């Protein structure tokens, strides 16, 4: 199935947004204290994020996806395809930090989890500032 | 920061579509043979699916999400809120098959991978047949 461009955008948008839900769950439980701390729920959330980080979303990026509507018009910036090295660095760092968040969440220390959750947030943001249009 | 209904719909639609991408990758490699078999890619795809299956998506289901637009108007059918025992049966069967798919994808036995992938497929459809408006 050589995916159509619309499908590539849709799948990557879905993947990011899925990670967002699960990031939001950890945020409520270890940063904001608005949901009771649960080791099993934080660990399940961390596992989704680590899994998607390793899911090889690079196969969803090709130049003919620029400006293409998935669920909405792609917010991908075209420098993504020129600054290839910088993408790989940011992406490989994200995988490393996501892996560590799942490991730490498994062990269930709230303080350790909050620290590593912070490192993952920084990894998400590093990619967005370079390669994602805010609008 | 409890989720609004629109966000619940969007997050659950995102979650399903993410599993759909990953199921598609496994289908290509072990059923249709249109992508070369990769041990690491099949297990990474299976891992996403098991993680999302275990991600507690029940938290995204409440009656005030019926008919609500996430990425698109929700296709959730309302008989869902009438079927608590059947939803739990289908969901826990889905977790079981998804867990097993991830276990066999790690061990690398390609025909057993094809077989269990079929079992996961049946679990997806079982839920859709009762609770998702077809397109
Ligand atoms: C680059 C290597 C990225 C990393 C790491 C993360 N994100 Fe991202 N994200 C990225 C791009 C290029 C885009 C735009 C996708 C498009 O085609 O439009 C996004 C988008 C998101 C979104 C919105 C998705 C949508 O529904 O349209 C969210 C909610 C999002 N990103 C969150 C997110 C989180 C939580 C991450 C870390 C855990 C993360 N992203 C990493 C690029 C990259
Ligand atoms: C019930 C417990 C379900 C299981 C198990 C699976 N799916 Fe599902 N899916 C379900 C519902 C109720 C809906 C509609 C959600 C809404 O509010 O609109 C869906 C939707 C999908 C979609 C489309 C999502 C979108 O982008 O709008 C896909 C692609 C999908 N489902 C795929 C899918 C796969 C691959 C599954 C097995 C791995 C699977 N679903 C299981 C309910 C349930």
Residue numbers in the entry:
A (entry chain B), B (entry chain A): 1 to 135
What do the authors say?
Thermophilic Hydrogenophilus thermoluteolus cytochrome c′ (PHCP) exhibits higher thermal stability than a mesophilic counterpart, Allochromatium vinosum cytochrome c′ (AVCP), which has a homo‐dimeric structure and ligand‐binding ability. A spectroscopic study clearly showed that some ligands were bound to the PHCP protein. It is concluded that the dimeric PHCP from the thermophile is effectively stabilized through heme‐related and subunit–subunit interactions with conservation of the ligand‐binding ability.
To understand the thermal stability mechanism and ligand‐binding ability of the thermally stable PHCP protein, the crystal structure of PHCP was first determined. It formed a homo‐dimeric structure, the main chain root mean square deviation (rmsd) value between PHCP and AVCP being 0.65 Å. In the PHCP structure, six specific residues appeared to strengthen the heme‐related and subunit–subunit interactions, which were not conserved in the AVCP structure. PHCP variants having altered subunit–subunit interactions were more severely destabilized than ones having altered heme‐related interactions. The PHCP structure further revealed a ligand‐binding channel and a penta‐coordinated heme, as observed in the AVCP protein.
